[PDB]
Amino acid sequence: ARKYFVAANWKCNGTLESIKSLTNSFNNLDFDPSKLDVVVFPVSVHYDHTRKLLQSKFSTGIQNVSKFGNGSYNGEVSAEIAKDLNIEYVIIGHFERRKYFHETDEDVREKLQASLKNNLKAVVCFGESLEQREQNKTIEVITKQVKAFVDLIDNFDNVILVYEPLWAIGTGKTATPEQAQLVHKEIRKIVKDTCGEKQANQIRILYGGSVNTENCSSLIQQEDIDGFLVGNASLKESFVDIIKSAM
Amino acid sequence: RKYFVAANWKCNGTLESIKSLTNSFNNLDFDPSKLDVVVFPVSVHYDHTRKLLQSKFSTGIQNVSKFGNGSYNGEVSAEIAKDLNIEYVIIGHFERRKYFHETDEDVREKLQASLKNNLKAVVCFGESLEQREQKTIEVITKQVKAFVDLIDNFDNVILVYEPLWAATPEQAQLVHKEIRKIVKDTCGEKQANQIRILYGGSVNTENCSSLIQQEDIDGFLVGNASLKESFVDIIKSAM
Ligand code: NA
């Protein structure tokens, strides 16, 4: 059975003090990290503080990684740098980077390649827009985005996929858990076709639409949904109840 | 004008290399009341670098978000930098304009955000080879006027001229003079004379004295030469 995977994406939020409070509440949840992965993704400049405060049962990672290695790339964090810090996970392809920062599929492929070359584990995100879904292009769009990188995966525990239903983010639409399950099953079929059946059965595919303490169980109880990359709910002490849905 | 010498480490460093390097930099006895010396490590190295450098060194980050806190995956807000006591940000560096499509509107937003949050800003601009062959003053003016009306305290914003077209010290000096005229015309005589205007082209131990001696160059935003222990001689040239 796939190991469930529950991730907190803090995005651009936090102070030193709010992290101290939050991490203290997180550390009070007794869970076994051999039975589920729980990963926290603070802002880059908060990584050291966050890593120090969380107990070792929590994994940690950063929200983006450079497509370039070391050198004259002002502002970027190379995968080589993250490896030297033992940063375990990186998020790649998050829709906010594609939206505000013009990140492309080619960018996602190059960042994944840098990450795996440096022994980082990658959480790689994709998903279609409302206009794409209304034109019945969900499968075409998702296949193209997944095929941009999936053939690079060399270890199916170390890359984690995230379906972001952009048509249901800020649009007034709500994805049901059944709608999400169908998209997850299709993502898994893409992986089987490029990488193999054992590989597709092993890879975690997370839901990355809106997740909170109310809907989390209806989502993770779906057969092909293996956890979540969680947004603002993960800034609340109640995020522990989301982690409990995977325990 | 207090001189200003800055180490831009760009995307370089390991925990061990930064230990060695900061240990050499800490051996230079300079007076931070006389001279500003700023180190700008990679974001994930900020904490380690700040803990290692003596407080005479100021520190900063190489970029800041144009957005506030909230749902902007991968970004670092000015509000976050303020809370961490990050003292400086670099804004508008040519590598961001080049690889990351950063625009003049982005520079102004980022400055406004940084100043709202009491950060000091090292703002970078400069013309390309094509613009030089044809537009130097038109282009640099468009660039400074993107953000200059936002400067409220002329000690806290540092301008940096990057000769993307490349430069002699004499050619650098001319642009610096032009830049200071832009500030004088926009913000006033006394404001123009207070603002530091640094050289952002290639600086090393062999050219640093020729550059700093120029009337309108007030220090440097230094690249690869700042990853070496000899950066201390660069700092010395400004002492
Ligand atoms: Na499931």
Ligand code: NA
């Ligand atoms: Na001078």
